[PDB]
């Protein structure tokens, strides 16, 4: 069984990430020519550390005469797996995370193909045999409060149910009683009365909370689930489902905050929203793609030992979360975020970028920075989702700055 060559794992642009090399002993040693690249995605099979990534999930494909071990080699050979990951976009994402904890996903919005997936801090496969936070895949297997990045869902629901429009005005005070508890804008900023497109661009909690309350628990949960919440996203990789409460258990105050992306509920069902970075990308992708949610995937195709395509992955939809008309309104609101609101750090001269930012507290008074977005605005070909974790540091707005940088460099790669 170790006398039979394991198949390779190769990026879409032809870079070999994992290989098996025959010994004179007869067995096969696993080699990693770019050790440290896309480590969580490539994965491993380790008694100590468990199994993860493609190594495990595609193990079969990679893995009378059966009784003779001397015939193991001559007979079968593992077929390779070609990822949708692009090595240059991957390197872009990994560089952008240097010195930070967090994660980045780049995806194609019309298919859900994953073009870059990076978690930090990371590890090399050489370190698995030494000692070895680093092992957590923060793209798919860690949950976070999404904060204001979740307002994209609240907005989409509000427009799709025909309960509001981008030009409808909202009172956006520094502080407001809702459901017997207080909702505040950041820094308690009183914004006065403003149109919703502006409350979204400036990311007012008091205004968006009012929209959430006007939607109700049933609708907010329903739309969250239509974008993927509750689903283990990934045709060919594992993602932990993003979570919302049982709407019957939610209170008005809890609903107000949930609609701003902060889970504060206390009941038998989970508090929410709690999201993955992958789910955040699927949302931006759906809005970029006319409202049609794609189930993301990371295997492009399988190759026989001699190079024949054995199978090809087909893009698959998880349904239509909002109308095309609704999606176009949310895209326009997202462009405002970057052109004149809290996402100006994502701006890149000579390309129109749209998105939505978020910030959320964790324990010890730390906090995390989020961004989802897409580009170019008029005919999107790339989506990005980012988390930069605080740790000991203030990281206000860093998600957006990383987001724009990654989008700009990935577009240039697409260009070549």
Ligand X SMILES: *[C@@H](O)[C@@H](NC(=O)c1c(O)ccc2ccccc12)[C@@H]1N[C@@H](C(=O)O)C(C)(C)S1
Work out whether 122 is an interface residue with ligand X (CB under 6 A): no
Query: How many angstroms separate the CA atoms of 85 and 124, rounded?
Result: 18
Q: How far is the CB of 136 from ligand X (least distance, A)?
A: 22
Comparison of 122 and 203: residue with beta carbon closer to ligand X? 203
Q: HSE, CB side, 13 Å, CA atoms: give it for residue 116.
A: 31
Binding of residue 139 to ligand X (CB under 6 A): no
Cα→Cα distances 210→102, 253, 260, Å:
31, 11, 10
Site string for ligand X, 45-84 (x = CB under 6 A): ----------------------------------------
CB of 104 to ligand X, least distance (A): 17
Rg (CA), the chain: 23
The verdict on 357 binding ligand X (CB under 6 A) reads yes
Shortest Å distance, C-beta 257 to ligand X: 8
Q: Looking at 18-26, 80-88, 103-111, 358-366, which segment touches ligand X (CB under 6 A)?
A: 358-366
> For ligand X, which residue of 82, 298, 360, 388 counts as binding (CB under 6 A)?
360
Please identify the residue of the shown chain whose CB is closest to the bound ligand X: 148
Chain centre to alpha carbon of residue 349: 25
- Does residue 144 touch ligand X according to CB under 6 A? no
Q: What is the DSSP string of 262-311?
A: -----SSSPPS-BB-HHHHHHHHHHHHTTTEEE--B-EEEEE-TTS-EEE
| CA 40 vs CA 54, 60, 136: distances in Å | 9, 19, 8
- Say if residues 134 and 123 touch (Cβ distance below 8 Å): yes
Contacts of residue 317, Cβ cutoff 8 Å, sequence gap at least 6: 292, 293, 294, 295
Rank residues 53 and 373 by Cβ distance to ligand X and give the closer one.
373
Nearer to ligand X, 111 or 357 (CB): 357
From CA 69, how far away is CA 72, in angstroms rounded?
Answer: 5
Residues in 191-230 at the binding interface with ligand X, rule: CB under 6 A:
203, 205
* Residue number, 123 or 170, with CB nearest to ligand X: 170
Closer residue to ligand X (CB): 148 or 154: 148
Show contacts with ligand X in window 241-300 (CB under 6 A): 260-262
**Least gap, CB of 316 to ligand X (angstroms):** 32
DSSP label of 231: S
Least distance (Å) between residue 268 CB and ligand X:
25
Cα-Cα end-to-end distance for the chain: 43
**Closest approach of Cβ 342 to ligand X, in Å?**
4
Residue 367, interface with ligand X (CB under 6 A)?
A: yes
148 neighbors 203 (Cβ within 8 angstroms) = yes
Whichever of 3 and 186 has its CB closer to ligand X, that residue is: 186
38 is written with which tokens?
A: 């896309």
Assess 359 for contact with ligand X (CB under 6 A). Answer: yes
Q: Which of 298, 262, 367, 369 is nearest to 118 (CA)?
A: 298
Helix (H) or strand (E) segment spanning residue 16: strand 16-22
Binders of ligand X among residues 292 to 351 (CB under 6 A) are 342
Which of 263, 291, 358, 404 is close enough to bind ligand X by CB under 6 A? 358
Q: Which stretch binds ligand X (CB under 6 A): 15-23, 103-111, 268-276, 352-360?
A: 352-360
Is residue 243 a contact partner of residue 251, using CB atoms and an 8 Å limit? no
Give the nearest distance from C-beta 416 to ligand X in angstroms: 33
Closest to ligand X by CB, 138 or 202: 202
Spatial separation of the C-alpha atoms in residues 153 and 286, rounded to whole Å: 11
Question: Could you say whether residue 186 binds ligand X (CB under 6 A)?
Answer: yes
Q: Which residues bind ligand X (CB under 6 A)?
A: 147-148, 186, 203, 205, 260-262, 342, 357-361, 367, 396
């Amino acid at each position: 069984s170790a006398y039979v060559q394991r198949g390779a794992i190769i990026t879409s642009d032809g870079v070999t990430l994992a290989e098996s090399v025959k010994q004179d002993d007869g067995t096969y040693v696993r080699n990693y020519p770019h050790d440290g690249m896309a480590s969580h995605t490539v994965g491993y099979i380790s008694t100590q550390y468990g199994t993860a990534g493609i190594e495990s999930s595609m193990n079969e494909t990679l893995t009378w005469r059966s009784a003779l071990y001397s015939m193991a080699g001559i007979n079968t050979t593992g077929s390779s797996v070609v990822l949708t990951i692009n090595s240059q976009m991957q390197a872009v994402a990994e560089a952008a995370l240097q010195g930070y904890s967090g994660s980045i996903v780049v995806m194609d919005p019309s298919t859900g193909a994953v073009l870059a997936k990076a978690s930090s801090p990371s590890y090399t496969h050489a370190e698995l045999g030494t000692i070895i936070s680093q092992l957590v895949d923060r793209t798919t297997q860690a949950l976070y409060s999404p904060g204001s990045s979740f307002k994209t869902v609240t907005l989409a629901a509000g427009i799709d149910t025909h309960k509001t429009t981008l030009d409808t005005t909202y009172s956006a005070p520094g502080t407001m009683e809702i459901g017997g508890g207080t909702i505040h804008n950041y820094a308690n900023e009183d914004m006065g009365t403003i149109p919703l497109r502006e409350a979204f661009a400036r990311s007012s909690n008091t205004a968006l909370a009012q929209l959430g309350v006007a939607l109700g628990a049933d609708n907010l949960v329903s739309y969250a689930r239509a974008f993927g919440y509750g689903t283990a996203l990934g045709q060919d990789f594992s993602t932990t489902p993003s979570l919302m409460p049982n709407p019957a258990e939610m209170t008005t105050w809890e609903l107000a905050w949930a609609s701003c992306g902060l889970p504060v509920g206390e009941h038998a069902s989970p508090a929410g929203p709690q999201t993955t970075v992958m789910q955040n990308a699927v949302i931006a992708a759906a809005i970029a793609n006319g409202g049609v949610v794609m189930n993301p995937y990371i295997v492009d195709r399988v190759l026989s030992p001699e190079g024949a395509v054995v199978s090809t992955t087909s893009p698959k939809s998880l349904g239509q979360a909002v109308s095309a008309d609704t999606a176009a309104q949310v895209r326009e609101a997202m462009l405002g975020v970057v052109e004149s609101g809290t996402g100006m750090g994502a701006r890149v001269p000579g390309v129109k970028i749209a998105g939505k930012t978020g910030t959320a507290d964790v324990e010890n008074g730390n906090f995390n920075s989020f961004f989802i977005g897409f580009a170019p605005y008029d005919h999107p070909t790339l989506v990005v989702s980012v988390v930069i974790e605080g740790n000991g540091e203030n990281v206000l707005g860093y998600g957006a700055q990383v987001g724009g940088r990654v989008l700009a460099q990935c577009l240039n790669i697409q260009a070549l």
